[PDB]
């Protein structure tokens, strides 16, 4: 699984403050990889936290505990 670079392009351009701003094809492909890693890292850390709490499943409460550090790593 992975993000379509088209989608990633639309996400980024949605937030640029200057309309003249563009992103090279290679940078786009990289961002596609970066977004994937971000999601997977959030999920893996969610699981590790759920296992620590002896949870049945990764619930929002467990996810919320790993968010603060994740954001600081990215």
């Amino acid at each position: 699984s992975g993000f379509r670079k088209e989608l990633v392009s639309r996400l980024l351009h949605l937030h640029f403050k200057d309309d003249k701003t563009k992103v090279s094809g290679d940078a786009l492909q990289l961002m596609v990889e970066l977004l994937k890693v971000f999601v997977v890292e959030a999920a893996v850390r969610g699981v590790r936290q759920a296992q620590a709490e002896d949870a049945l499943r990764v619930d929002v409460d467990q996810l919320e505990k790993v968010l603060p550090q994740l954001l600081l790593d990215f």
């Binding site: 989608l7 403050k17 992103v23 090279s24 290679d26 961002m31 970066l34 699981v47």
Partner: protein, 93 residues
């Protein structure tokens, strides 16, 4: 069914797939709201990424964001910068 709502659904689908894989690999399930939470979190992250990239490019007198801009995004983590760097040289051929 607006434009951003279609964007959010799109990432939510990909996040779902990504989480499915992590779930089967680790025999731990994700609640629906967790996957949705990660999805919204991911949408919000694109905002930070986009603005940093723009400012980094601008810092270098450029209007076209390049791979050095992207690698700056990953500078916080040694493994991350290593992961993203190799990947960069991989697509440079």
């Amino acid at each position: 069914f607006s434009y951003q709502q279609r964007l959010k659904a799109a990432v939510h689908y990909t996040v779902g797939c990504l989480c499915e894989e992590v779930a089967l690999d680790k025999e731990m399930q994700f609640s629906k709201q967790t996957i949705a939470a990660i999805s919204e979190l991911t949408f919000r992250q694109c905002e930070n990424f986009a603005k940093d990239l723009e400012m980094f490019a601008r810092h270098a007198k450029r209007t076209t964001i390049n791979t050095e801009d992207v690698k700056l995004l990953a500078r916080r983590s040694n493994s991350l910068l290593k992961y993203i760097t190799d990947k960069s040289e991989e697509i440079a051929q």
